[PDB]
Amino acid sequence: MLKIISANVNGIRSAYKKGFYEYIAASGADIVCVQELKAQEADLSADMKNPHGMHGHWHCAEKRGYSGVAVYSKRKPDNVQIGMGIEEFDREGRFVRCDFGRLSVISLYLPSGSSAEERQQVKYRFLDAFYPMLEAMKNEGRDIVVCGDWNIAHQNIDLKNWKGNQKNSGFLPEEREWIGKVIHKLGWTDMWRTLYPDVPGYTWWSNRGQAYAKDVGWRIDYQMVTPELAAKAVSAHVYKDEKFSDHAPLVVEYDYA
DNA sequence: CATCG
DNA sequence: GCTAC
DNA sequence: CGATGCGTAGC
DSSP: OEEEEEEEOSSHHHHHHTTHHHHHHHTOOSEEEEEOOOSOGGGOOGGGTSGGGOEEEEEOOSSTTOOOEEEEESSOOSEEEESOSOHHHHTTOOEEEEEETTEEEEEEEOOOOSSOHHHHHHHHHHHHHHHHHHHHHHHTOSEEEEEEEOOOOOSGGGBTTTTTTTTSTTSOHHHHHHHHHHHTTSOOEEHHHHHOTTOOOOOBOOSSTTTTTTTOOBOOEEEEEOHHHHHTEEEEEEOOSSOSSSBOOEEEEEOOO
């Protein structure tokens, strides 16, 4: 029995102030994947590195209060890879991977290109560099969960206002196409959609207007899983009882040992 | 990027 | 206040 | 539709 949680915390410190540290243990989660630390190794409390005695591995940005991802695990990773082998992005702490034997979990924070132009460009280049290793990972012939903030809504059902957002970063045709390829041409399972084909399952809501109240959201947080493990999926839900961030934790349970 | 006009 | 969101 | 504005965490 295996439970994986993926959460963009929007400031690890903010989240800890909002009750996330307790959630890490109450959830029963065996592995937690976090994005948007907004912190560097120095700013990290010991409780934000080894929560409840879990192991932990992180990759922080070369800028204070920016990006970074981590994975915490009740078990000790017999291997770990920080950064994705190309510095241009590794400078932004955007990719951590952990291998527990046959299993590999990775925390990913794909670049948001909504703020401005060059950001969109970088996002595209990131997709370019990433696709090949998504493929290689697929080919590894093992159980791999790539979870995190993919910053791309796949289809109309994946966001309330699909109509007016077709010209905004996050729902452009190219992005949806990329996702499509990684799911179909590459064979990665979008675990949530595959588990509940009709439920939207938003994971994010803009701070604008009353988006969070009117449930005007996006499903931009994924758990992309390999076929064999995917099939072993049994449950999933978006935890929404407490709010630790402008994202919500996405929890998936697999029958696996 | 929800919302207005 | 400023930045990236 | 296309044009207005705009909350947050952390420097």
